[PDB]
């Protein structure tokens, strides 16, 4: 017979960082293996499609990288923008909304993210279809939608709602009655505003915060550096330099030395491409997760535990990052608790009364009925409880009285 019910709460904001894309590399298999050499190229042709199917595989990766970006960010049919007057009920979003004074309209926090995450061998890099500016416009639209219309913009039209009321719904969604928000609106807004400031201090000082995106960059850089270094290998040939073979040997002998280099260099590309395809699959899975969260975290409200940070999810805000997305998850976390005596039911006239919502609690002398996620004791009445069965059935049922609001109206 003991239940702990939180008496206070804190609003916390956590940051979840996910990769969305990887550098769209492209390798010219012919130039890589036989750079500017007719004699080598003609030998390379004896391997059929081995060269061009690698060009195909890398193209396939490069294309899905734009698909990944588009699926994560382009989830909004329109570009929404906040009003010139930031009357959001005391909630300060100035650090996540776009900064008009910048050459690229990114938020303060996005700039922090971008400032933390950092040849002639047929190896080139293609640009993404969506530039950083375009990504910023999408996160701005998603954010403006989230702030001014809640989840309605996800389902259909963006329907304006006062921010404080939007939060009231977010609270009901976690099992906390809306009056809690309004009564504590100043506290909640202050906790939110403080939590965002903490995000900035963390991101501005902890380089490891963006390790998930920095690691993607490092793996791809390592893959390309390895590929280029392989050109220096002999693979059994007299020289790694193709021109030195050709300038020294007649064709009947040069071709043998070249075939040794072609086999090694062709094998090197195949190794590279295979690793890129496997790595691309990992990124795709991450992008799919990020897209899922955007829809089920930013556009809505998540009932899924620890899907959108630890705690009871209220709302989330996307921020862009180099080759990825960062989510700021705003959650409700119980902060302080008390030990109450409890009971599954209360006896009145032999009838067993159960809470419609909430639990029965006792402070040692009086029984009250209160919400599970916040202590707010109420007198037990017939409008708080319902009757089913009787006192001889329920294990642990206790005696009390249940107030009937009608009695005094008829009594007087």
């Amino acid at each position: 017979n003991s239940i702990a019910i939180p008496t206070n709460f804190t609003i916390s904001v956590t940051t979840e960082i996910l990769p969305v894309s990887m550098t769209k590399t492209s390798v010219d298999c012919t130039m890589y293996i036989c750079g500017d050499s007719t004699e080598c190229s003609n030998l390379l042709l004896q391997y059929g499609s081995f060269c061009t199917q690698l060009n195909r595989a890398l193209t396939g990766i490069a294309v899905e990288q734009d698909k990944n970006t588009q699926e994560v960010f382009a989830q909004v049919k329109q570009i929404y923008k906040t009003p010139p007057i930031k009357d959001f009920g005391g909630f300060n979003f100035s650090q996540i909304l776009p900064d008009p004074s910048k050459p690229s309209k990114r938020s303060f926090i996005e700039d922090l993210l971008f400032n933390k995450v950092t040849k002639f061998n047929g190896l080139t890099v293609l640009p993404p279809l969506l530039t950083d500016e375009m990504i910023a416009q999408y996160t701005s639209a998603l954010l403006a939608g989230t702030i001014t219309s809640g989840w309605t913009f996800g389902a259909g039209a963006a329907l304006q709602i006062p921010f404080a009321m939007q939060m009231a719904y977010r609270f009901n969604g976690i099992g906390v009655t809306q009056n809690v928000l309004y009564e504590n609106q100043k506290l909640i807004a202050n906790q939110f505003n403080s939590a965002i400031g903490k995000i900035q201090d963390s991101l501005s000082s902890t380089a490891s915060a963006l390790g998930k995106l920095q690691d993607v960059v490092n793996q791809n850089a390592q893959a390309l550096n390895t590929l280029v270094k392989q050109l220096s290998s002999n693979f059994g040939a007299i020289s790694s330099v193709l021109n030195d073979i050709l300038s020294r040997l007649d064709p009947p002998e040069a071709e043998v030395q070249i075939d040794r280099l072609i086999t090694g260099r062709l094998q090197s590309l195949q190794t590279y491409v295979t690793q890129q395809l496997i790595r691309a699959a990992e990124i795709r899975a991450s992008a799919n997760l990020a897209a899922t969260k955007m829809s089920e975290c930013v556009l809505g409200q998540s009932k899924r535990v620890d899907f959108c940070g630890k705690g009871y999810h209220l709302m989330s805000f996307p921020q862009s990052a180099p080759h990825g997305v960062v989510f700021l998850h705003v959650t409700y976390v119980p902060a302080q608790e008390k030990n109450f005596t409890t009971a599954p039911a209360i006896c009145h006239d032999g009838k067993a009364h159960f809470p419609r919502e909430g639990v029965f609690v006792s402070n040692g002398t009086h029984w009250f009925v209160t919400q599970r996620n916040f202590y707010e004791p109420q007198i037990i009445t017939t409008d708080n409880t319902f009757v089913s069965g009787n006192c001889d059935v329920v294990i642990g049922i206790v005696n009390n009285t249940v107030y009937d609001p009608l009695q005094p109206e008829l009594d007087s």
């Binding site: 734009d66 382009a74 909004v76 049919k77 329109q78 570009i79 929404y80 923008k81 906040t82 009003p83 009357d87 009920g89 080139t124 293609l126 640009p127 993404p128 279809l129 969506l130 530039t131 500016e133 375009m134 416009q137 999408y138 639209a141 403006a144 939608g145 702030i147 001014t148 219309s149 913009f153 963006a158 304006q160 006062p162």
Partner: protein, 66 residues
């Protein structure tokens, strides 16, 4: 022409390289053929291949009030 300035080669300049034979349009429309770094190209007006900075969507101020 990827990663080539138009001096190393109608012409339109892009961050993705040097486009040739696509009519640059100042308007913006939804992506049809993706060229990269925002630019997308289509066969539209008399017909020609145009190239343009892509529309992300219809811009909209939500009528938010307290």
């Amino acid at each position: 022409y990827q990663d080539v300035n138009c001096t190393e080669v109608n012409v339109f300049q892009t961050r993705a390289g040097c486009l040739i034979g696509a009519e640059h349009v100042n308007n913006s429309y939804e992506c049809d053929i993706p060229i990269g770094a925002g630019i997308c190209a289509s066969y539209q007006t008399s017909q020609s291949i145009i190239a343009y900075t892509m529309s992300l969507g219809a811009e909209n101020s939500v009528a938010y009030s307290n």
